[model samples]
Target: KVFGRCELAAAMKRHGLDNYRGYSLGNWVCAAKFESNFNTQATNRNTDGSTDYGILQINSRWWCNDGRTPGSRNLCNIPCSALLSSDITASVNCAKKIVSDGNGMNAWVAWRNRCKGTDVQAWIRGCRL
Candidate 1:
């Protein structure tokens, strides 16, 4: 599922990404836009044989087990496939874990390069969050 900006904002809010761990909802939405363009099924293989899955791009290297990543920690204890669902419940929950683990929003390179230190609110200005 490919969500519009507002749709993604609302979904993340519902899933508790709103101001989670001190990161703003807008920042979360903006990170999703950059990470996967709000597409739930997005996946990217890394050079290290790991992969990223879902809109938040949770990685196989440390966050999930894909059965292929060399040393997946599976810290979230979820299959990588779980992150690809349009529901976003798992993805959002795992993302919160990432932030609470001290990686913060910086866990996503897309967030750091695009959403961090920027006017993230603009990503949801018309979303009525």
Candidate 2:
């Protein structure tokens, strides 16, 4: 709800995600940009007929229980609404958990299509962080 590029960097640094899963801060910034433009409340309907949630756009079938998507695994143990809260603790924590499953930043298609194999450092240009 309140993260600009600089603030996003700070949060990444704070959460140890600046280097999480061998991902650079730039990779996170790039993924977050294309996924949600850093908006914590962003949601999009996936082509596979599922919804992507929060700033990272995690899938509901695995991460949240919204009572809308049947067969939702809701492995993140949270409601879909939790991802939209102004306090991003739950969302960010869930994103970290998603990344920790050893998939790295490849979980988001945007990363694979848009940010991957590019010089992501431009995403953090002059961020001082």
Candidate 3:
């Protein structure tokens, strides 16, 4: 499925990263490449017969009360899912929420640096913005 740039931009703004063009997109692409190979509808199987669902590969069981309800399958009202089932924005945001909040961008920045052969945590710590 085709991903919507406008919807992705809106999602970035929702997370307080309104500068959607330069480094933001770069960070997103990096995260997507690492997370699920940019697969929006990718899912993983659990030994219990439950599933990890969606592009971000969010554990459906953990986020959805162990698959007791389908609402949890929908990315919790995040627009990126609706716009593109494999939307990179949803995956990135979920990663941020799970891994870092105020410092999510720092994590992304670190990933970017490491992808280019630079150190990760050190770069994140030294980042100005």
Candidate 4:
């Protein structure tokens, strides 16, 4: 049973993930779980009510077009509309850019530290992404 458009959209929405590029569904899921526990409306603050709003804990006010409001939904100036398109491939690509460039997931070599006590592959599977 292949995933239909609505199915994929629901899946992505439920997981609080935009998309993935150059990565399998497993990889994407792992990253999402690690990043934000799949909470699309997750938010955090540093002992203050200054920071808040959106999934992935995106501070829309600071990163969006205005950088002064509480919820801008601009997606850190990465064009949420484009990123939230119906095309899963496009969404995934956009997410890859954010993950690698914006979030610095590119620096994590955890996937390569394959020592006995540091099996990155095992960790990946543990996330079930």
Candidate 5:
């Protein structure tokens, strides 16, 4: 499932990303835009041989277990395929945990490069949250 801006915002907010870790819904929406473009099925392989899975792009190296990334922490205790579900609940849950892990949103370079210290509210200005 590919979500538009508002739709993604609503979904993420519903799953508790809205201001979850001292970050705004705008920050989350912006991160999601750059991370996976709101596509639930998104995946990216890293040079370190880890793969990021699903909308939040949770990494197999430290988050979800793909049974492939060597030494994966599996901190989220979920299969990597769980992140790809159109439901997005697993992805959002893992994202919330990762954010609370003290890295905030900086755990994702996409958020750092594309969403940080910017006018992130523009990402959700008309969402009527």
Candidate 6:
């Protein structure tokens, strides 16, 4: 299901992602927006031939797989479809793993391309958590 920015902000806060790994809530929300437009079902095929899955667009290279995409690293050992849940529980945890791995939001090209150097604070500003 698609979500409003505020709804996504609130959900991220509730999931304890507001301060995950020293990244701010805005960082999380902004990354999610650029990655999936707040839709947990979002997915994309990268020019590098990798596929990104779900809200954070976690990479198939080191996270999950669509099965049709061969040779995913699957370090999270979870199926790619599992990230498409509106629940976001599995997606959040997997994202935590990704962040804690030291890439932070840099793991996502969306973050690097769009969110980086932007006003992340605006992503959560006036949005109730």
Give the candidate number with the greatest TM-score: 5
For all candidates in order, the CA lDDT equals 0.73, 0.77, 0.44, 0.39, 0.75, 0.74
Give stretches of model 4 more than 4 Å off: 1-21, 46-53, 59-63, 69-94, 100-129
Model 3 worst lDDT run, 10 consecutive residues? 120-129
Candidate 2's residue-wise lDDT over 1-129, tens digit each? Answer: 746777757756776676666777777777777778878888999777788877877788877887778887878788888888877667777777777777767777888888888877877887676
Collision pairs in model 6: none
Best by lDDT: 2
lDDT of predicted model 4: 0.39
- Give all TM-scores, in the order shown: 0.90, 0.86, 0.40, 0.37, 0.91, 0.85
Q: Which digits, one per residue and each the tens of the lDDT, describe model 3 over residues 21-62?
A: 324433443444343454566556656555555544455533
Q: Give a tens-digit lDDT track for model 6, residues 1-129.
A: 888767655665667866676787667666677777778888788887877777777667767766666776768788888888777778877777777878766777777888778887876677545
By lDDT, the better pick of 1 and 4 is: 1
RMSD of 5: 1.4
- Candidate 1 per-residue lDDT over residues 21-74, each given as its tens digit: 577766666666677876888888778877778876777888787887776686
Cα lDDT of candidate 2 equals 0.77
For each candidate in turn, give its C-alpha RMSD to the true structure in angstroms: 1.4, 1.8, 8.4, 8.6, 1.4, 1.8
- Which is the better candidate, 4 or 5, if ranked by lDDT? 5
Instruction: Give per-residue lDDT, candidate 2, residue 40.
Output: 86
